Amino acid sequence: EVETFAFQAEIAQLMSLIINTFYSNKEIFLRELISNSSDALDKIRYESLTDPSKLDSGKELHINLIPNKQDRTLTIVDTGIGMTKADLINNLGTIAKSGTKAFMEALQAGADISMIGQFGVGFYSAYLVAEKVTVITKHNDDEQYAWESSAGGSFTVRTDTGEPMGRGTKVILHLKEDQTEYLEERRIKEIVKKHSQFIGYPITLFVEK
Ligand SMILES: O=C(O)c1cccc2cc[nH]c12
Which helix (H) or strand (E) covers residue 204, if one does? strand 203-205
DSSP assigned state of 59: -
User: Does the C-beta of 177 come closer than 6 Å to ligand 1?
Assistant: no
Q: Is the dihedral of CA 118, 97, 61, 192 positive or negative?
A: negative
The CATH number of residue 47's host domain is 3.30.565.10
User: Does the C-beta of 146 come closer than 6 Å to ligand 1?
Assistant: no
Q: Are 151 and 143 in contact (CB under 8 A)?
A: no
User: Does the C-beta of 163 come closer than 6 Å to ligand 1?
Assistant: yes
Helix extents (H) in the chain: 9-20, 28-50, 85-89, 96-108, 185-195
Q: How far, rounded to the nearest angstrom, does the alpha carbon of residue 24 sit from its chain's CA centroid?
A: 20
Best mutation site among 71, 158, 163 for ligand 1 pocket (most ligand atoms within 8 Å of CB): 163
CA separation, residue 159 to residues 20, 147, 197 (Å): 31, 9, 35
User: What technique solved it?
Assistant: X-ray
| Length reported for the chain | 209
CA angle 74, 40, 205 (to 5 degrees): 30
> Which resolution, in Å, applies to this structure?
1.4
Beta strands (DSSP E) in 92-153 are 130-138, 145-149
Q: How many domains does the chain have?
A: 1
Q: How far, rounded to the nearest angstrom, does the alpha carbon of residue 187 sit from its chain's CA centroid?
A: 19
Q: Are 30 and 199 in contact (CB under 8 A)?
A: no
Rounded Cα distance between 191 and 6, Å, is 33
Rounded Cα distance between 102 and 92, Å, is 18
> Is 97 annotated for ligand binding?
yes
Domain that holds residue 56: 3-205
